[PDB]
Structure formats: C-alpha cells, structure tokens
Write a protein that binds this ligand. Structure first.
Ligand code: HEM
Ligand SMILES: Nc1n[nH]c(-c2ccc(O)cc2)c1-c1ccc(O)cc1
Length: 392
C-alpha cells in the first residue's frame, strides 16, 4: 500500500526513514489515518516554503469534504482561532497576557518547580517526571497566566488526553469536555474575583465599548484553547526534552555546572524535539509547485517539523546538540509564518526554569527503567511517554 503516516509514536529517536525521504523525495504522497492522501514535506527548504505561503491554508483544512489528517476535536471555526482573535481586535492583548514577563510570573514558576521537586524527593525514587513534574508545572503555569484558581487546573488538564487526540473519527468525549470547559470559562468571565491574567484582561475588555460586539463564545474559546494548547505543548515538550537531557549525561553535567548556557541548550532541545506527532496540516487553495510536485488546489499538505529540523543542509550534524550554532533559533519548533506560535516565549521560559530547577535539585537524575520500557501514547497530536520513571 501507499506509505502511511505517522511512521512512529516514539519521541526518543527519529526514524532513519525520515533522512531517506528527505534525500530521495522531500515531498511525496502518503496516506493518513483517515484514508486520505496527502503530501508529506520533509526538507527545511520545502517546509519553509509551505509555511510562508498563505495559499497553503490552515483555516481551509476544516472545510467539509476536504482530505483530512484526523477528525476535528474543536468546532470548525476554531481552526481559525487566531484569525478570529485578530478580527475581534484582541491579538495584542492576548499576546501581552501570555508573555513570561509579568511581575512575579518567573518567580512563581521557580517556586512551583521547586516545590514539585521537593515533594518527589520527600517521597523517594522512582519519581514520574511527566505526571508529577512536567505536566503539573505546565498546568500551574497556565492557571497563573490565565488568572484562574490553581485548584481548577487538574480538571481542566484531564480533558487533554482526549482533546489532543489524532483520531480517524469524531470523538464523543471531546464534545462533552469542550462544552463543559467552555461553560467554565464563561463562568470565569462573569466572576468578579478574576482580575488578573489573560481571563482578567478579557473580562475587562468584554465590558469595554470597543469590544461590545465580540461574542461571549469567542472570549470563552480563547480561555479553553490557550489553556489546552499551552499545557499540552509545554508539558509534552518539557517531558521529551528531559529524556534528551537524561540521555546526554555530559550535557546534563555542563548545564548543571554552567546554568547560563541553559537558554542555548533549550533552544537545541527545541530544534531536536519530536513532540509533534504529525506534520502540520495545510490545504492548498491554488495549484502551487513544491519541489518536483505540482500540488493541486484542494490537496492536503503535511509539514514535517522534524524533517526540517534535522535537515543537514541547514543544521550540520543534525542529531547532535551543539550550543554554538550560528543559526540557533532558525528551527521550526514553533512553526513559521502567519501561524507562528503565540506562546513561544512562554514555552521557552517554562522549559528553562523547569530544567534549571531539576538540575539543581536532582543533578544525578537518570531513567529508572531501560529506555525501551517507556510507553508511547498512540493516536495523539503529541508524542509522549505515559510515565517517565527516574531516580537521582
Ligand atoms: C514548547 C512549547 C510549544 C511548542 C513547541 C508549540 C508549537 C507550536 C507550533 C509548531 C505551532 C504552529 C502550528 C501550525 O502552524 O500549524 C503553534 C501554534 C499555536 N500555539 Fe504553540 N507551542 C508551544 C507553546 C504554546 C503556548 C504556551 C501556548 C499558549 C499559551 C501556545 C498556543 C498556540 C496557539 C493558540 C497556536 C495556534 C496559532 C495559530 O493558529 O495561528 N503554544 N505552537
Ligand atoms: N488542534 C487542536 N486539537 N485540540 C484542540 C483543543 C484545545 C483545547 C481544548 O479544550 C480542546 C481541543 C486544538 C486547538 C488548540 C488551539 C487552537 O488555536 C486551535 C485548536
């Protein structure tokens, strides 16, 4: 049969297959889990082209009858969430509220990381660094950034193992959790105690005359989607970064010894990250030449981030973490172009502070199981181990 995507849910190694495709056929046809055909793009040059040409549309991926990567877990209008935010005149305000720059926010991240780590040391090895460190760090950060109660984090988080599924078919639970989580965020907008963070800001703008015709549904949706995307993305990235560090003891020791190099190491950890389980989907809105292929209007294109980020033509010795590259932020871990991640700085800070805190508290961190014993989540939009058992 035609080559099927994805190739592997493992987030600890890139398949050899990826370099062979990039060399032989850096754009080629594949079949997705729904049985649709798509073009898989796997070189830095071609990934960048697709991402920088808006005629490859994000929004149009949601059109009825399109070839699909996977089934929607959001309303179709939510695929255009950033466009809807810009159209409501809310982009600057949202972007400002999710920077890691608010007074106290970095200290709160540090404090939270340290407390989680003290609790694991009290309890004794083995510790699970996903469920008991990275994901609670992510969840606490996002409650603080949104201005919502910390104690509401866990129930919101538990929606995410369904919300970020990569399924061939619609998921009944996704609707149940979406509607419940929208109702919660609508209640937050009406709650006078919520005066800080992204929700406190949205709540003020909602009652300002310049935003009187912005819908209550959009305001709630921003809350739900920014919580879910940020939590899943920071928690998953930090988890798989910790694997890459733990398996580079020389690097772990360098960063421990010289923590000022942590921002450069996180940037390399981003470059090499396999967190995104699928290419980023786009729908062609015109006939467009990409390499040796004429992509036709209506066809699905999948931009393979690791294809670009491990391309030796751009990043020589791609599989090695080198802290002195001349082009260190030029990876595609946060995307490129119109839909460049709005949370990028926040994501970087979360990882930096989590890593700094772990290396200080557990300088001897190591896996407590052979690496092949990690259980990789399937049929999900992220690659993540179900547990990350460590000792120190
Ligand atoms: C290390 C952490 C993160 C990584 C690796 C990541 C990665 C990405 C990538 C690759 C995209 C582009 C998707 C595409 O073009 O199809 C994206 C978009 C997005 N990110 Fe992130 N992200 C992270 C953190 C965050 C955070 C913290 C938030 C929010 C608080 C966030 C919110 C979103 C949203 C809302 C979009 C969609 C933007 C659009 O539709 O134009 N991300 N992210
Ligand atoms: N691609 C996705 N899969 N699942 C979601 C999502 C986010 C939060 C939820 O509670 C439910 C689904 C998304 C999502 C997240 C952020 C967006 O701007 C648009 C879509």
């Amino acid at each position: 049969v035609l080559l099927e995507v994805p190739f592997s849910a493992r987030g600890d190694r890139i398949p050899d297959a990826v370099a062979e495709l990039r060399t032989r056929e850096p754009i080629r046809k594949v079949r997705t889990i729904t049985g649709a055909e798509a073009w898989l793009v796997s070189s830095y040059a071609l990934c960048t082209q697709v991402l920088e040409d808006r005629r490859f549309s994000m929004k149009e991926t949601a059109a009825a009858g399109a070839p699909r990567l996977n089934a929607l877990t959001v309303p179709p209008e939510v695929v255009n969430n950033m466009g809807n935010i810009a159209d409501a005149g809310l982009r600057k305000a949202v972007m400002k509220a999710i920077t890691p720059k608010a007074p106290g926010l970095e200290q709160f991240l540090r404090d939270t990381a340290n407390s989680l780590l003290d609790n694991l040391i009290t309890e004794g090895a083995p510790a699970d660094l996903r469920n008991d460190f990275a994901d609670p760090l992510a969840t606490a950060l996002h409650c603080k950034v949104l201005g919502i109660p910390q104690e509401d984090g866990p129930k919101l988080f538990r929606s995410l193992s369904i919300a970020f599924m990569s399924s061939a078919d619609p998921i009944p639970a996704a609707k149940i959790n979406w509607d419940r989580d929208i109702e919660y965020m609508a209640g937050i907008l009406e709650n006078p105690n919520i005066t800080t963070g992204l929700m406190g800001e949205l709540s003020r703008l909602r009652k300002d005359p310049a935003y009187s015709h912005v819908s209550d549904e959009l305001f709630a949706t921003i809350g739900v989607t920014f919580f879910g995307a940020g939590v899943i993305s920071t928690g998953s990235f930090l988890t798989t970064a910790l694997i890459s560090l733990i398996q580079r003891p020389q690097l772990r020791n360098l960063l421990h010894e010289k923590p000022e190099l942590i921002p450069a190491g996180v940037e390399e950890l981003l470059r090499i990250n396999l967190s995104f389980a699928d290419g980023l989907p786009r729908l062609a809105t015109a006939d467009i030449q990409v390499g040796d292929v004429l992509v036709r209007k209506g066809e699905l294109v999948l931009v393979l981030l690791e294809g670009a980020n491990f391309d030796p033509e751009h990043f020589p010795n791609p599989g090695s973490i080198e802290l002195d590259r001349p082009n260190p932020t030029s990876h595609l871990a946060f995307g490129r172009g119109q839909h460049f991640c709005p949370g990028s700085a926040l994501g970087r800070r979360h990882a930096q502070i989590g890593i700094e805190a772990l290396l200080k508290k557990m300088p001897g961190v190591d896996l407590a199981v052979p690496i092949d014993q990690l259980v990789w989540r399937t049929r999900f939009q992220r690659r993540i181990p179900e547990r990350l058992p460590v000792l120190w």
